[PDB]
Design a protein around this ligand. Structure first.
Ligand SMILES: *[C@@H]1O[C@H](CO)[C@@H](O[C@@H]2O[C@H](CO)[C@@H](O)[C@H](O)[C@H]2NC(C)=O)[C@H](O)[C@H]1NC(C)=O
Ligand SMILES: *[C@@H]1O[C@H](CO)[C@@H](O[C@@H]2O[C@H](CO)[C@@H](O)[C@H](O)[C@H]2NC(C)=O)[C@H](O)[C@H]1NC(C)=O
Ligand SMILES: *[C@@H]1O[C@H](CO)[C@@H](O[C@@H]2O[C@H](CO)[C@@H](O)[C@H](O)[C@H]2NC(C)=O)[C@H](O)[C@H]1NC(C)=O
Ligand code: TRP
Ligand code: TRP
Ligand code: NAG
Ligand code: NAG
Ligand code: NAG
Ligand code: NAG
Ligand code: CA
Ligand code: CA
Ligand code: CA
Lengths: 512, 499
């Protein structure tokens, strides 16, 4: 069985799914004086609901087209993880329940978002050789094929991001920065790679801290004091919105201003931090973003949702209740005739599709792996003696083998193929946080890109004419730990301090 | 359900267990041109089999003593992990086979050895609130109670090791080192803590590299190129024997000498690295060790194994075969069965101290004393709801975990055993030195100090420098500074780029 809330449909081939409908779980912890109950999820993520609709749309589009898969229909079974390991583990146990022992089996699973959740899911899914395709996990620890046999993804890993941040710091000449990271499998490897690159490029790092969503008061107070004492203006952060929100709340409360934030893709567009009342602290942030895609007909499908016609979607009722502050009865009562456009929510208040375009690609990747097995000729196949598999009775490892040798064309005329570490490549977009004069609201404006296909030293391109430092200033800030020696003078040494900080002593008589 | 070879005995209460009988799995490739098959395991670990016997001895000592858990018997169900996550998960799926729904339930698991394996097992065991008591996992990531809700251990974590290594470096006046760590969840946090500690004491680090048991040739060659391009003679390693053997082999075949190693506990006494062939390279290593306990009647129990009489044990047959190079039947001579295990030198009855075996002993007694506390309880003065006692006839896992969280008992050595908030113990450390035997020609470990975890900062380390052979022959402290100190008539200067 598994969790009660779900969204499933019958079919010949079933796909799994894991999306973060909620942001986290309740803060209550048991004292083990009675039998423990089921934990509950607290907040509502309107971004996680949009990504699910992309998978549903892709499947329903495949079923309608006879060119892609005639005579075969795809179903689905989608669960919620709440950015938590236990919920994902329960869902995965439900996925492979048939193989432990009537229960339909899961051909493939569209993976989770967090790297910590994805690793835990893959550890269990790899025993049964079920392919798993992730759309957001980008840790480099998941590229080890000696442990994760059947992990694939449609997003690049973070080594290029760390090198790009080092290149950005090298472009605007600074040698006195700080680093902040989340205490999980995502923020630690990236910050280690950045430290390596910065030491390579002769950049001095002052401090280095770790934060978490469940950090107590003392840890946050200690972290804020460390930032307060140091004179390093530039701070680099590798974390997500939920893990960064308490620290940003504490900093905004204490009114610490003037820092220059470099943001990873995880929180460079998060709605938990991109708020008008945080602007006097996080204004003028420079961060990375992915490349947008086109999915015609998506918005209409998004706008045709309803908690009554959606028989196959069990997450719609809570969506309606949260959208209209209502209560459906089987807090005013729900009339059921309201308009989605009336309420402004992150559901349809977007500009580009960047992660929701990866779900589309994952679904078509699995669809094209099944079209290859479907159409083949005897003696021309990837299996033993050139034989073909059976589409009527297809297994998971055959799908994995066909996924490892996939090469197809996107809707918008471009090729997709996966490396032998199950990874992809792509460009980046650098954005800058502005303030909209009409409606006060954070606005992200693109200033440059990072062409990952070029040689070393020719990848970064930044247009300085469209960067507003701290949101208002037009002058490049300063971070060097030491005023430059002017002329006719010599460097000095300060004991116990890095080589980046000196004294500017004058030259001996008779020299120059 | 569960794997084929196992140690199983029935009883009123069943205890789990995971031990690394095999060192690793086969280097195989399965391009999936056919249906995949189960992987195999390669080398035989005699140290792991000794740890397995400690739990059996503790259980059979409990069952024979009327003062501990009378009128009740304890069973077990012990499996093998082969130092891999997949096998441990296969066994754990059998451990929690009834809770997910003919197999008895599990109330306690004696945890694994590796940190990654322990993490993978705990992620699944925390769903059903089944306590897990590890004996060798010392990672700092397992102290987090937000994720690992039912994890306890009888070994201290790795912060004090990094602090002690920094203390040793400061003691001997070195400021130019290099670091190497294994690529897992045990080496990386430890080496990061060491870097954090060393940054404060003004110690500069030249190179940092990561290794793994499955590293290819062109990642070992790069690492050994980086090592020999440096001028630092002091190298700090956070890894285990299996994860360090390829690098050591490559260094030995290149004949690189003059380096000074500071070993962590994982490979301080490993038999894969302490080999006389490697002495001209790994000689003079300084490492850490735990404090050795005492189990009186343990050698007799170890020296009475038999492939036919030990019906309850499924590993005894392979132990006999690997020990005697003999083949049992239901090139390789046939087994008579009357052979003697005292005539073969293996890491089974050839030991000088009991450290991890004592940890297994302590874990089993911790579980037993929690059960005893459940048993001898007076209603109205309990720990549940309005103050109540749990019935020993229908005891569940979470009640055992609750009692383990509030445990305090005195072991056979006359000292209390209490678990801190995050289910950890605090203990001393012993610093050893690698020597060369004058008669046998083997490698001898000699204690040259200790680390005190109770005294104040700056008064913990204690080194007896008179008994340290710096490379097996030297009697002078090595020089490991980047540059020579200036004199009275000169000053310092700055080299661009260098630290
Ligand atoms: C801050 O420090 C950086 C490097 O420490 C300075 O960048 C140097 O600038 C000079 C000219 O001012 C160039 O000749 C060097 O090549 C630069 N170094 C590098 C590594 O690019 C920077 O100028 C300093 N900032 C200020 C305001 O003086
Ligand atoms: C940990 O080690 C310290 C010192 O190595 C132990 O303290 C010693 O305790 C004995 C007996 O109580 C004394 O005779 C010694 O003089 C103590 N040494 C010092 C330096 O004070 C301590 O007892 C050890 N802890 C445990 C639990 O055994
Ligand atoms: C190697 O360097 C260390 C520190 O860089 C030297 O330690 C210094 O020793 C002198 C005399 O013992 C003390 O006055 C200093 O305070 C020590 N330095 C520090 C930072 O405390 C050590 O002497 C050097 N060794 C050699 C052989 O030159
Ligand atoms: N790269 C992120 C996943 C991610 C991308 N965008 C996000 C937005 C919100 C939360 C997570 C994400 C990770 O490794 O975890
Ligand atoms: N502490 C090690 C495990 C370990 C301790 N002692 C050992 C001896 C041999 C092998 C492994 C070990 C880890 O977490 O990974
Ligand atoms: C993929 O297909 C395209 C078009 O058929 C072809 O040009 C290309 O060589 C193929 N392989 C790769 C790796 O792109
Ligand atoms: C990245 O950008 C370069 C130049 O802008 C382009 O040639 C290349 O095709 C892009 N790659 C992707 C994956 O978008
Ligand atoms: C290896 O180095 C040692 C140390 O100098 C030397 O004595 C020996 O001859 C070298 N060659 C070997 C051991 O083959
Ligand atoms: C455990 O019990 C003994 C009994 O006297 C007591 O001395 C000791 O302080 C207790 N330990 C803790 C941690 O309370
Ligand atoms: Ca200092
Ligand atoms: Ca008894
Ligand atoms: Ca340098």
């Amino acid at each position: 069985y598994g969790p009660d809330q779900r969204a499933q449909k019958k079919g010949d081939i079933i796909l799994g799914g894991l999306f973060p409908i909620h942001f986290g779980v309740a803060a209550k912890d048991q004292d083990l004086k009675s039998r423990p109950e089921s934990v509950e999820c607290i907040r509502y993520n309107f971004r996680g609901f949009r990504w699910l609709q992309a998978m549903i749309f892709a499947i329903e589009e495949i079923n309608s087209s006879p060119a892609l898969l005639p005579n075969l229909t795809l179903g689905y079974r989608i669960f919620d993880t709440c950015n938590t390991v236990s919920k994902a583990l329960e869902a995965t146990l439900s996925f492979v329940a048939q193989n432990k022992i009537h229960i339909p089996s899961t051909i493939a699973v569209v993976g989770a978002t967090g790297s910590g959740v994805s690793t835990a899911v893959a550890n269990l899914l790899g025993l049964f050789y079920i392919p798993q395709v992730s759309y957001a996990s980008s840790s480099r620890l998941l590229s080890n094929k000696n442990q994760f046999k059947s992990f694939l993804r449609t997003i690049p890993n973070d080594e290029h991001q760390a090198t790009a941040m080092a290149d950005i710091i090298e472009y605007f000449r600074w040698n006195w920065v700080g680093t902040i990271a989340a205490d999980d499998d995502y923020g630690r490897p990236g910050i280690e790679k950045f430290r390596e690159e910065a030491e390579e490029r002769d950049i001095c790092i002052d401090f280095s801290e770790l934060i978490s969503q469940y950090s107590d008061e003392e840890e946050i107070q200690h972290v804020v004091e460390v930032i307060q004492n140091s004179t390093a203006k530039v701070i680099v952060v590798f974390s997500s919105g939920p893990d960064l929100e308490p620290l940003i709340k504490e900093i905004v409360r204490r009114n610490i201003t003037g820092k220059i934030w470099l943001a990873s893709e995880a929180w460079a567009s998060s709605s938990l931090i991109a708020m008008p009342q945080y602007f006097h602290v996080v204004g003028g942030t420079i961060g990375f973003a992915l490349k947008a895609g086109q999915i015609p007909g998506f918005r209409e499908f998004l706008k045709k949702v309803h908690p009554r016609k959606s028989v196959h979607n069990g997450f719609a009722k809570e969506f309606w209740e949260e959208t209209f502050n209502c209560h459906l009865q089987e807090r005013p009562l729900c009339t059921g005739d309201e308009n989605i456009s009336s309420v402004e929510t992150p559901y349809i208040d977007y500009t580009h599709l960047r992660i929701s375009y990866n779900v589309y690609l994952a679904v078509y990747s699995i669809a094209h792996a099944l079209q290859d097995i479907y159409t083949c000729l005897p003696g021309r196949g990837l299996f033993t003696n050139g034989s073909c598999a059976d589409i009527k009775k297809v297994e998971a490892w055959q799908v994995l083998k066909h996924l490892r040798h996939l090469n197809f064309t996107n809707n918008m005329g471009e090729q997709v193929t996966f490396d032998e570490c199950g990874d992809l490549v792509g460009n980046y977009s650098i954005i800058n946080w502005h303030l909209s004069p009409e409606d006060g609201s954070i606005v992200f404006k693109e200033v440059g890109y990072y062409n990952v296909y070029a040689k070393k030293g020719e990848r970064l391109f930044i247009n300085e004419e469209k960067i507003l430092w701290s949101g208002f200033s037009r002058e490049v800030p300063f971070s060097n730990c030491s005023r430059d020696c002017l002329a006719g003078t010599r460097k000095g040494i300060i004991e116990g301090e890095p080589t980046c900080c000196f004294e500017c002593v004058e030259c001996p008589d008779g020299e120059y | 359900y569960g794997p084929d070879q196992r140690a199983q005995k029935k009883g009123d209460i069943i205890l789990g267990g995971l031990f690394p009988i095999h060192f690793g799995v086969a280097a195989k490739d399965q391009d999936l041109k056919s249906r995949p098959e189960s992987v195999e395991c390669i080398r035989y670990n005699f140290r792991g089999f000794r740890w397995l016997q400690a739990m059996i001895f503790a259980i059979e000592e409990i069952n024979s003593s009327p003062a501990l858990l009378p009128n009740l018997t304890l069973g077990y169900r012990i499996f093998d992990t082969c130092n891999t996550v997949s096998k441990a998960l296969e066994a754990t799926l059998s451990f929690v086979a009834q809770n997910k729904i003919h197999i008895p339930s599990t109330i306690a698991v004696v945890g694994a050895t590796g940190s990654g394996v322990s993490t993978a097992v705990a992620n699944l065991l925390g769903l059903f609130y089944i306590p897990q008591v590890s004996y060798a996992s010392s990672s700092r990531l397992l102290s987090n109670k937000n994720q690992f809700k039912s994890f306890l251990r009888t070994i201290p974590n790795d912060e004090h090791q990094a602090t002690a290594m920094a203390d040793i470096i400061e003691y001997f006046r070195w400021n130019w080192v290099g670091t190497i760590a294994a690529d897992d969840d045990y080496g990386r946090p430890g080496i990061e803590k060491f870097r954090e500690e060393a940054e404060e004491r003004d110690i500069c680090i030249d190179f940092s590299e990561l290794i793994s048991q499955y590293s290819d040739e062109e990642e070992i060659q790069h690492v050994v190129e980086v090592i020999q391009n440096s001028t630092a003679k002091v190298i700090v390693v956070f890894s285990s024997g299996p994860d360090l053997e390829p690098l050591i082999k490559e260094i030995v075949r290149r004949n690189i000498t003059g380096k000074i190693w500071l070993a962590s506990e994982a490979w301080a006494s490993s038999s894969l690295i302490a080999m006389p062939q490697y002495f001209h390279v790994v000689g003079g290593t300084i490492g850490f060790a735990l404090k050795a306990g005492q189990i009186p009647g343990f050698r007799e129990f170890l020296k009475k194994v038999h492939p036919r009489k030990s019906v309850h044990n499924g590993f005894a047959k392979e132990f006999w075969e690997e020990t005697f190079n003999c083949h049992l039947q239901e090139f390789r001579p046939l087994c008579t069965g009357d052979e003697n295990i005292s005539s073969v030198e293996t890491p089974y009855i050839d030991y000088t101290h009991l450290r991890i075996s004592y940890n297994v002993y302590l874990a089993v007694y911790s579980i037993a004393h929690a059960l005893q506390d459940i048993y001898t309880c007076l209603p109205g003065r309990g720990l549940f709801t309005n103050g109540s006692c749990a019935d020993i006839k229908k005891v569940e896992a979470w009640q055992v975990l609750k009692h383990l969280r509030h445990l305090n008992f005195t072991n056979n050595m006359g000292e209390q055993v209490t678990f801190d908030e995050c289910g950890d113990l605090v203990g001393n450390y012993s610093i050893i030195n690698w020597h060369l035997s004058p008669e046998d020609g083997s490698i001898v470990f000699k204690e040259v100090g200790y680390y005190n975890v109770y005294a104040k900062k700056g008064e913990r380390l204690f080194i007896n420098e008179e008994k340290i052979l710096w490379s097996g022959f030297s009697r002078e402290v090595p020089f490991s500074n980047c540059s020579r100190d200036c004199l009275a008539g000169t000053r310092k200067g700055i080299i661009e780029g260098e630290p």
